[PDB]
Each structure stands twice: as C-alpha cells, then as structure tokens.
C-alpha cells in the first residue's frame, strides 16, 4: 500500500508553490509542499512533491489529475510507497553576488603572471609544441 506523499512532474512555467498552495488547498489543508527549482539563477526544473493529510487525498488527487492538460504541458502525478521521504530542496533564490577580492597585490600577481607565462610556454613545449620566448 501507498502513502499520502505524491510526486508531480511535467510542470509549466509560472506554476510555483503560491499556485500549488492556493490550488490544492481545495483538496486539503496541506501537510507540506516542495518544489524543484534550479539552485543557480533559481527557476523551475518542473516538478515537486506534496502531502495533503491523507493517503486517500493523495489517491483522489492523482486519479483526478494523472493525465491532466493545461497550457501545453501536461502534468503527470504519481502516488508513492509507505514513507518515501521528501528530504531536500530548500527553496533556492537567484543569489546576490559578492566580490571577495582582489586582496593579493598587483606586484605579486604580476610576478605570478611572469612565471606562469613561462610555465605555459614550457608545457606547450613539452606537449610537444615548441615555442620561443
């Protein structure tokens, strides 16, 4: 026998936990929802999970909406075994970038450039692709 956890996928854009919450509150006061975004420049990777309260609530939602169509994706939703433990996907944003540098001085990094210039020339020389200078 299955669990109240449900796995939905094949989602469109513009369909976020805001939408899932106000929609599936029609079916039940939810235990929990989670959505799949990318972690970097966070946008939807088009799937998610939920538990409403009950196994029966999950069953009827899946039965109702298994092959449901929308704007021109269609969702596929499935009922899961006992447990099966949504465990991850802290909701990730598009992060603010921060600049930790340049601490090391112009003189030292220029000497780094001077020595690794020659390092580059010798590694291409030993590849072997000879190069003067």
């Amino acid at each position: 026998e299955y669990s109240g956890i449900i796995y939905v996928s094949r989602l469109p854009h513009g369909f976020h936990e805001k939408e899932l919450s106000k929609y599936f509150a029609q079916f039940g006061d939810l235990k929990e929802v989670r959505l799949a975004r990318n972690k970097k420049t966070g946008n939807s990777r088009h799937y998610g999970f939920l538990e409403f309260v009950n196994k029966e609530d999950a069953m009827i939602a899946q039965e109702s909406m298994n092959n449901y169509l929308l704007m021109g994706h269609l969702l596929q939703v499935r009922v899961l075994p006992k447990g099966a433990k949504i465990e991850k996907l802290y909701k990730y944003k598009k992060r603010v970038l921060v600049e930790k540098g340049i601490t090391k001085p112009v003189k030292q990094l220029k000497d780094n450039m001077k020595q690794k210039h020659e390092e580059r020339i010798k590694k291409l020389a030993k590849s072997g692709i000879e190069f003067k200078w």
Binding site: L109, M113, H117, R120, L124
Partner: protein, 256 residues
C-alpha cells in the same frame, strides 16, 4: 606588432599536431581568446560588436559547405509590415551578382507560431549558420527564440540597421548585407575577464591574410577594452601567449 612568423610556425605546428596523432571537424577549427581587465558587471548583455575585416572567410565557408553537411546558410527575421514589400526576387537580382544568396525571410508571427515547439524551434534554426535580425526586434527576441540560440556563438542573433529613416528602402540592405558579409565580423561581450572568438579554419584563406586580419583586430582592440593578454588554440590546445601585455596589469589595484 606580433611576429607574423610566430603566427606562421604556430599554424604549421598545429597542422602537424592535427594531421597524425564529427570529431575532427570539432578539433580543427581555430579559437582565439583575449583576457581583459573586466567586462560590464551586473549588466547582462547579448549585443555583438561588428569588427571590420578586409577579407571574409564566409566565401571559403560557403565553398566548403557546398561539399560539407552542416549547410552553411543564413536566416532573416523582420517586422510584420515589410514581408509584403520585400521578396526574394530583388536579392536574387542583386546578391548573385556578387555570388551569395539569402535563404529565407521570416516574420515574428511565423517565428512565434511555427518555431514554437522548442524541439522544433531548435531544429529549425540549427541547420542555419548566420542569424540576422532587425535593429528594433533584437532586444525583444530572447523571450521568443530562447537562449539555446544564444549559447552558440554562431547562432547568436545580430541586428542590422535597416530603416533608412524614414521610408526604409531595400537598397539600404542590399549594400549593408554586402558590408557585413565581406567586411565585418560580430563578437560578443561576456561577464568577467575571458572572451573567446571562433575565428576560423585553416582550410580557408591563408595564414598570410589571416595575419593581417589578426593585426587589424588587435590594433582595434588594444584601445577598446584595455585588454590584458591574447592566446590561441585549436579546440583543445593549452594556451600559447602570442601577445603578452603587462603595462595594463599595473592599473588593476589602481582601480580599487
């Protein structure tokens, strides 16, 4: 200037490096990279700067693709009004005179209607080599056509200054497309320091002509972006310093 004989021995040495030990077509094409101080941060751009050249490699590319399979070819996208105004007959009068040919002209409605179905969108465009767009539409495109076009440097769209203000004429294009075919090359601005250019092939026009074209771009660009250094590779090779600029390295902590 850079030693042209360093360029010449570079091309012959990578010729032997490539001669003996899809895949070879990936390997053999030349890339030239520039490091600079910094590009524009916190401003994500997709524009292209059309750097003038004296000799185009697109005629070698077209002569190569007549035999080859990727079918080097062009696409055009335009405002809604001009499709009834323009046709292929005019450019077939004009551009075969020089010996080039435009494949197709498209409208934005066509673009959003039939080259939706993202698989089919990609599949429609992927055969095309050179993508060209309206000076008005260029900002609106990526909501429509998407970043799979923009990731590949060949497939990244380019404007053209079309509207002779006012009462746009075709002749304004039938010279301008000749200019950008024979005499200009578009180049991208990323974030950061690093910038690649898919410069060309070695089966195409000679290293002697490529050397002066490389001299032209370098003399244009040493002032453009305060650039740091220049290297070359062909699609795997670790970087060869051919221009090593350190007078600009002194200013980096001067900026802060």
């Amino acid at each position: 200037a850079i030693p042209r004989e360093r360029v010449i021995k570079a091309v012959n040495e990578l010729i032997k490096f490539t001669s003996k030990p899809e895949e070879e077509l990936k390997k053999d094409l030349q890339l030239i990279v520039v490091n600079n101080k910094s590009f524009t941060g916190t401003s994500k751009s997709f524009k292209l700067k059309l750097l003038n050249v004296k000799h185009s490699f697109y005629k070698p590319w077209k002569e190569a693709s007549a035999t080859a399979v990727k079918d080097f070819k062009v696409l055009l996208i335009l405002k809604d009004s001009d499709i009834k105004k323009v046709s292929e007959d005019d450019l077939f009068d004009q551009l075969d005179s020089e010996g080039i040919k435009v494949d197709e002209i498209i409208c934005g409605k066509d673009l959003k209607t039939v080259y939706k179905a993202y698989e089919a969108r990609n599949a429609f465009i992927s055969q095309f080599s050179l993508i060209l767009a309206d000076d008005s539409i260029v900002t609106s495109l990526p909501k429509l056509m998407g970043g799979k076009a923009y990731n590949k440097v060949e497939t990244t769209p380019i404007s053209i200054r079309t509207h002779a203000n006012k009462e746009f004429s075709l002749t304004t294009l039938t010279n301008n497309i000749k200019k950008v075919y024979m005499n200009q090359l578009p180049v991208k601005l990323p974030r950061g320091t690093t910038l690649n250019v898919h410069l060309g092939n070695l089966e195409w026009l000679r290293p002697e002509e490529f050397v002066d074209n490389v001299e032209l771009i370098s003399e244009q660009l040493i002032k453009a972006y305060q650039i740091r250094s220049i290297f070359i590779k062909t699609n795997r090779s670790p970087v060869l310093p051919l221009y090593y600029n350190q007078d600009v390295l002194d200013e980096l902590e001067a900026k802060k």
